[PDB]
Short mmCIF file of N, CA and C in Angstrom, two decimals:
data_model
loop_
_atom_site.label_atom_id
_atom_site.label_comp_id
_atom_site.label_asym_id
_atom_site.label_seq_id
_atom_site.Cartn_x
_atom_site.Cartn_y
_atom_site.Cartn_z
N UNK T 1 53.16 -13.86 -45.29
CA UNK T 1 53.09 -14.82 -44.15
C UNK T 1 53.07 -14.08 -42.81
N UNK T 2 53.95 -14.54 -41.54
CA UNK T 2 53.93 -14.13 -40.28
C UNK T 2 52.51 -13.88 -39.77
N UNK T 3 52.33 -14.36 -38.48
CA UNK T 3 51.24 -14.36 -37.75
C UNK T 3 50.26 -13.11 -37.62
N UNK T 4 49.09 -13.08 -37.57
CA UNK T 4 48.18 -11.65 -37.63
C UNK T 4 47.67 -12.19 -36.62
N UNK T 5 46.64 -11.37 -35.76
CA UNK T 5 45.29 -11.67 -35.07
C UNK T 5 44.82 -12.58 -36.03
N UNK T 6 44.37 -12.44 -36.88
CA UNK T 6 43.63 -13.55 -37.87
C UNK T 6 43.99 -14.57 -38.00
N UNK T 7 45.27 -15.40 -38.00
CA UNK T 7 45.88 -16.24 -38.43
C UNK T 7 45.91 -16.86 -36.85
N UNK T 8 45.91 -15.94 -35.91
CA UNK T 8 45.66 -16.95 -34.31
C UNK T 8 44.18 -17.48 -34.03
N UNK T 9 43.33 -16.70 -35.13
CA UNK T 9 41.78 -16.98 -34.60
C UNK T 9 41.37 -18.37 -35.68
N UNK T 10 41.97 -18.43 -36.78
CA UNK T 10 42.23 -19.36 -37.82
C UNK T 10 42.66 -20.33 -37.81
N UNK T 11 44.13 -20.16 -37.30
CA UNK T 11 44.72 -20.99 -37.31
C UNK T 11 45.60 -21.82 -35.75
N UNK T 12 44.77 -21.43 -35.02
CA UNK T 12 45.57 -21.42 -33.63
C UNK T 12 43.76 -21.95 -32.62
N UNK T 13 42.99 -21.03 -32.62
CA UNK T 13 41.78 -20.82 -31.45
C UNK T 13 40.67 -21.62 -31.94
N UNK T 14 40.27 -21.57 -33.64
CA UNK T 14 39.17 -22.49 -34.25
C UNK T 14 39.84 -23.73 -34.09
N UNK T 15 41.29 -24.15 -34.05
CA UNK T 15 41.71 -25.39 -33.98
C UNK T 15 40.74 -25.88 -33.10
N UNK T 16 41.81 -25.79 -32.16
CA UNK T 16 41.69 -25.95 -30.46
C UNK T 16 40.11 -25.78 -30.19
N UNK T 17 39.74 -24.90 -30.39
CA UNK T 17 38.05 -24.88 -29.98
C UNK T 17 37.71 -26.15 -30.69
N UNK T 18 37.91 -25.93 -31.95
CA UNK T 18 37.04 -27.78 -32.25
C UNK T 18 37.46 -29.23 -31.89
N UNK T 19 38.98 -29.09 -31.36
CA UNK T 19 39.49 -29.91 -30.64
C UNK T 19 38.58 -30.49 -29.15
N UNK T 20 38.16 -29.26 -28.94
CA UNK T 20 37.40 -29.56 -27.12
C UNK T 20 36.44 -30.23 -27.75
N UNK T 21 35.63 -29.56 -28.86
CA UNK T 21 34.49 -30.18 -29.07
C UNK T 21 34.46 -31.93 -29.46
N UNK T 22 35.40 -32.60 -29.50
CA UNK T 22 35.72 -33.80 -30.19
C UNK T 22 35.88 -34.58 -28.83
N UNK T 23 36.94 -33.96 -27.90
CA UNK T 23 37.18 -34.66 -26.66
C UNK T 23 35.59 -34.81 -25.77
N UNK T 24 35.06 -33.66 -26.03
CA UNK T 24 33.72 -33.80 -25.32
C UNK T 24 32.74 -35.15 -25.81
N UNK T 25 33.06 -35.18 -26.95
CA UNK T 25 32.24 -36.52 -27.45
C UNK T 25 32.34 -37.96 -26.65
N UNK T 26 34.14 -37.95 -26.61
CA UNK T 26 34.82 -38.53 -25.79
C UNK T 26 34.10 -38.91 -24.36
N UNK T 27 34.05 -37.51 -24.22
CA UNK T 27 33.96 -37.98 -22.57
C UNK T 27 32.11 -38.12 -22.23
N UNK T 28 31.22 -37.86 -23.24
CA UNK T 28 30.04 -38.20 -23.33
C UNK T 28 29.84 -39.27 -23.73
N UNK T 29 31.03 -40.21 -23.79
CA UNK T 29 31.14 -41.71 -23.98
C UNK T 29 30.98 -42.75 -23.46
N UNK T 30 32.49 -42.10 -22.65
CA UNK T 30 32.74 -42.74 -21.72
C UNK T 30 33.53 -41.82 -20.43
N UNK T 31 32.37 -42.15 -19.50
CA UNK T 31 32.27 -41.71 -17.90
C UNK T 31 33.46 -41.67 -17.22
N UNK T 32 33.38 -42.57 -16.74
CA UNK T 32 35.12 -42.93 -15.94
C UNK T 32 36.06 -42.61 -16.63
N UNK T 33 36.98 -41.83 -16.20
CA UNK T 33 38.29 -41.23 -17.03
C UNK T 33 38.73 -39.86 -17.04
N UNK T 34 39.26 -39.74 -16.49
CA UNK T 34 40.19 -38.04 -15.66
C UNK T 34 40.49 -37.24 -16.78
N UNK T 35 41.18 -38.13 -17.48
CA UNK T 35 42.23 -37.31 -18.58
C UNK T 35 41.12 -36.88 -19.57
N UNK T 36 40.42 -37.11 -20.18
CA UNK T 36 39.37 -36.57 -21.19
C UNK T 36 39.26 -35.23 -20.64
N UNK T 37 38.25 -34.91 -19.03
CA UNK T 37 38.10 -33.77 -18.71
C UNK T 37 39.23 -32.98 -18.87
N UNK T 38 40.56 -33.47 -18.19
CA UNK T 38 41.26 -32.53 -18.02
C UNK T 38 42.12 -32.02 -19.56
N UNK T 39 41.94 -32.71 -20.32
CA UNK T 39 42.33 -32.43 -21.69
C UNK T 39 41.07 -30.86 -21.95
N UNK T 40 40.32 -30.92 -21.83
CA UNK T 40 39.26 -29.98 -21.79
C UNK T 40 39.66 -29.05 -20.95
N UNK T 41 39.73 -28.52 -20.23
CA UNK T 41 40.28 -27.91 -19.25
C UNK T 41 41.36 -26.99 -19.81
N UNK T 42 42.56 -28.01 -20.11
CA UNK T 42 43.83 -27.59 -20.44
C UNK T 42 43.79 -26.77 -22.07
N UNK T 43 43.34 -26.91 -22.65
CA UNK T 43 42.55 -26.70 -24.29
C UNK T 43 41.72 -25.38 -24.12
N UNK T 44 40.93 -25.67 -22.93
CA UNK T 44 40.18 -23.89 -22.61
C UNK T 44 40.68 -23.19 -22.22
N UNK T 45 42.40 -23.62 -21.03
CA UNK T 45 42.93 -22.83 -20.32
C UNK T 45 43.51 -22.05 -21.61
N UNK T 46 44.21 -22.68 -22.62
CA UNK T 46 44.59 -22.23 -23.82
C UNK T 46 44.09 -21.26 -24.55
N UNK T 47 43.06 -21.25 -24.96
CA UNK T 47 42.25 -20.66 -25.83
C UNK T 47 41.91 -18.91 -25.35
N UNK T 48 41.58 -19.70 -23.95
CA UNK T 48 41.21 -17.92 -23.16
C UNK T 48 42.50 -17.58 -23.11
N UNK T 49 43.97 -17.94 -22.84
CA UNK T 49 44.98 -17.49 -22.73
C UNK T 49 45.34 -16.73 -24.05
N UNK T 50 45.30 -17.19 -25.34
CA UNK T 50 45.65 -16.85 -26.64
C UNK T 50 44.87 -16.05 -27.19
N UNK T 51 43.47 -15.98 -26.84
CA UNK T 51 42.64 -15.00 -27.21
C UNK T 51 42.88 -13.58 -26.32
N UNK T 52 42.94 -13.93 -25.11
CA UNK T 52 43.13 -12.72 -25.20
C UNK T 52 45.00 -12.05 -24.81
N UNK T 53 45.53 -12.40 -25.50
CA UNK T 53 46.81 -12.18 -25.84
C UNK T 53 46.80 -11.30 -27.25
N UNK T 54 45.94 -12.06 -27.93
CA UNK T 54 46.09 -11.83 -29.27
C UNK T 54 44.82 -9.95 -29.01
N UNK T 55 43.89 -9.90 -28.08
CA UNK T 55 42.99 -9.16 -28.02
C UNK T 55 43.80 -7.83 -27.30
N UNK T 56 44.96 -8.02 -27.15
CA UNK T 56 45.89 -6.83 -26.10
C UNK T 56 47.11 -7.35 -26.26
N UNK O 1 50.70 -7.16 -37.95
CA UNK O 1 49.65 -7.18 -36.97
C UNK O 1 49.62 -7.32 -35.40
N UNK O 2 50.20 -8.60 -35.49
CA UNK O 2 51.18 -9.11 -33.94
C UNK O 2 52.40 -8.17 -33.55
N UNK O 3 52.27 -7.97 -32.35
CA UNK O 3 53.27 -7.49 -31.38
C UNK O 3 54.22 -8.40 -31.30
N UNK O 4 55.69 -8.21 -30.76
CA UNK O 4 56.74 -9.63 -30.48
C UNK O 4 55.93 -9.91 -28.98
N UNK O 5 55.22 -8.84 -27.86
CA UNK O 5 55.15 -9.62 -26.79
C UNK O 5 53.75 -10.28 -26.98
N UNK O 6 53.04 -10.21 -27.97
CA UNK O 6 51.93 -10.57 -28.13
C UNK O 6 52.63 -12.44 -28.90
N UNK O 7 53.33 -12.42 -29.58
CA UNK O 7 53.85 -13.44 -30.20
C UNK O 7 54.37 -14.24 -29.02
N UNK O 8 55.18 -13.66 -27.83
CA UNK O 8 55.91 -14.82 -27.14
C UNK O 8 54.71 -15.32 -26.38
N UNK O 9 53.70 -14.40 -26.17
CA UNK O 9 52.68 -15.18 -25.07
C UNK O 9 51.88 -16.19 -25.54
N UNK O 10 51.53 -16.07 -26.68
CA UNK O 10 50.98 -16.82 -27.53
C UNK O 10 52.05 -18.46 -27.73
N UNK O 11 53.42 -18.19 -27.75
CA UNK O 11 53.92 -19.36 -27.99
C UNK O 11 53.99 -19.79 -26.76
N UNK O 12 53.93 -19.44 -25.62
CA UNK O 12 54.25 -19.59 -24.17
C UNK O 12 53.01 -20.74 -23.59
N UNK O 13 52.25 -20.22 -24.04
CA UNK O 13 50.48 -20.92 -24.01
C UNK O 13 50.81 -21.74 -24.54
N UNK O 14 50.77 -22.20 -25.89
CA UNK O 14 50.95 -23.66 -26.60
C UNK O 14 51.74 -24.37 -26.07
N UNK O 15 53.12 -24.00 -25.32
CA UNK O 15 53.97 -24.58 -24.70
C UNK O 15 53.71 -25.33 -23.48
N UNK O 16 52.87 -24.14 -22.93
CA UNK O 16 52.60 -24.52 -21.45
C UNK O 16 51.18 -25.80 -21.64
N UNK O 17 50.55 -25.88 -22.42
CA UNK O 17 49.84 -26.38 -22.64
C UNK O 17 49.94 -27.98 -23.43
N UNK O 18 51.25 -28.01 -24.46
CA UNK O 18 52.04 -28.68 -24.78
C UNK O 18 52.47 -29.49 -23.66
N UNK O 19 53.28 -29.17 -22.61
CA UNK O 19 53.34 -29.89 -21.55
C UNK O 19 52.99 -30.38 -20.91
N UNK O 20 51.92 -30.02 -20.17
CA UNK O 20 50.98 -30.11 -19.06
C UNK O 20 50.05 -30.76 -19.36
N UNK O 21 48.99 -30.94 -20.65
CA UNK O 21 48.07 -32.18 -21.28
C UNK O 21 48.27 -33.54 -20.90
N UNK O 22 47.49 -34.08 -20.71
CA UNK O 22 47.53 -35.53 -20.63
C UNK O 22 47.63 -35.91 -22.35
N UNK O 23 48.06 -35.94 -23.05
CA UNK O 23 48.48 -35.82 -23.88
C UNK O 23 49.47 -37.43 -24.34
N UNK O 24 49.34 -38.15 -23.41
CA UNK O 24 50.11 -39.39 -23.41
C UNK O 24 49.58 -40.72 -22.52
N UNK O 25 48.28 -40.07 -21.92
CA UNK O 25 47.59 -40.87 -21.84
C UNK O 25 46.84 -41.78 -22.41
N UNK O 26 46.39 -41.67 -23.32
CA UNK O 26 45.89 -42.87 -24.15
C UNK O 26 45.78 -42.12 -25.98
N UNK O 27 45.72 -43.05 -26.21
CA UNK O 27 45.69 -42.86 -28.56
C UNK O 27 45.06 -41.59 -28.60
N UNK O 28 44.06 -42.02 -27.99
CA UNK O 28 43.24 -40.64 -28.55
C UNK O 28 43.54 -39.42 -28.18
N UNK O 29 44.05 -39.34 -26.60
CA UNK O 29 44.61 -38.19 -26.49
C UNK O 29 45.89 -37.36 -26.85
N UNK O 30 46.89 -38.54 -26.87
CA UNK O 30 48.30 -38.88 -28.18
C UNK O 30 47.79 -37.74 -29.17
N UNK O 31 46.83 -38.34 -30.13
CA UNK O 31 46.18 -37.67 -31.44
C UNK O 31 45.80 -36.09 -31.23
N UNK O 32 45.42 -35.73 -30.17
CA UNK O 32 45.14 -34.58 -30.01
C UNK O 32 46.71 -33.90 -29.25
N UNK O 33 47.30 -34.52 -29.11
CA UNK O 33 48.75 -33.98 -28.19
C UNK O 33 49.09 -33.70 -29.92
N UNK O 34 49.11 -34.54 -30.61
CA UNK O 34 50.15 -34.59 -31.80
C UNK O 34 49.60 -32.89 -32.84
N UNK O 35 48.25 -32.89 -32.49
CA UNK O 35 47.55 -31.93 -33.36
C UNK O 35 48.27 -30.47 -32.63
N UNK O 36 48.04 -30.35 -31.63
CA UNK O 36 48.64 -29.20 -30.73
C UNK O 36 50.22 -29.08 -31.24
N UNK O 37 50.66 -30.18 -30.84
CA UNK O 37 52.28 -29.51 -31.69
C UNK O 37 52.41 -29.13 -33.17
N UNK O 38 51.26 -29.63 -33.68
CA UNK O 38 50.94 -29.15 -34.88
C UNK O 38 50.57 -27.87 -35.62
N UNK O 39 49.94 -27.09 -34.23
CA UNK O 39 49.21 -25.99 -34.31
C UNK O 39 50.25 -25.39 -34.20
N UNK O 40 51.24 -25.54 -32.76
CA UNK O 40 52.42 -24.90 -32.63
C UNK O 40 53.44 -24.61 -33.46
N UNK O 41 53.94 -25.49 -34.70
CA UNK O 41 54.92 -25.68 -35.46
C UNK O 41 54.44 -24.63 -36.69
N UNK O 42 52.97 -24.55 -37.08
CA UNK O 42 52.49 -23.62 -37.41
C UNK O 42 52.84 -22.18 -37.42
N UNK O 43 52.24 -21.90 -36.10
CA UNK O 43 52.53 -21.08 -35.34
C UNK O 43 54.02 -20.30 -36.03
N UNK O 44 54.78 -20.97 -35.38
CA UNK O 44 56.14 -20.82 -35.28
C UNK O 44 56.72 -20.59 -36.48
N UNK O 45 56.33 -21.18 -37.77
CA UNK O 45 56.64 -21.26 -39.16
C UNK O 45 56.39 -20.02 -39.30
N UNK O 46 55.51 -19.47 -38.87
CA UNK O 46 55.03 -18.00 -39.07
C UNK O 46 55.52 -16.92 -39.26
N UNK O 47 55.81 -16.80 -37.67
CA UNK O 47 56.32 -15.84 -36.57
C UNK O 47 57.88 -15.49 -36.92
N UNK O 48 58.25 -16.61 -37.55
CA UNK O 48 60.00 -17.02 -37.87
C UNK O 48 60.37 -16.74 -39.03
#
């Protein structure tokens, strides 16, 4: 067990990356509405944060 | 593989991110708040 690089790109970054991709559907839905984007936003701020954590 | 400071930043992110989401704004985003603590608890099961 215990976490590897692999297990953050697995199980942590493919999440989340396909997570944005779902909210984006969302917000290619429907227009009006803050929180969709910023769910996006907050999900990428993530991703670049953990990647490269995990990269150094 | 992981470093411990590579581990806290990593939980620090989910956290900070955990928080700060609109995440309680509506079902759908609920659903994706709920998945993130999900990822986190993960995470953590891990590391621990």
């Amino acid at each position: 067990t215990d976490a590897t690089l692999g297990s953050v790109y697995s199980e942590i970054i493919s999440p989340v990356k396909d997570c944005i991709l779902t909210v984006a559907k969302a917000v290619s839905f429907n227009p009006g509405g803050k929180d969709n984007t910023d769910a996006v936003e907050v999900l990428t701020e993530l991703n670049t944060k953990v990647e490269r954590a995990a990269m150094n | 593989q992981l470093s411990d400071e590579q581990k806290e930043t990593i939980l620090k992110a989910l956290n900070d991110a955990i928080e700060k989401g609109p995440w309680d704004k509506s079902n759908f985003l609920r659903v994706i708040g709920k998945k993130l603590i999900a990822i986190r608890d993960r995470f953590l099961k891990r590391i621990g």
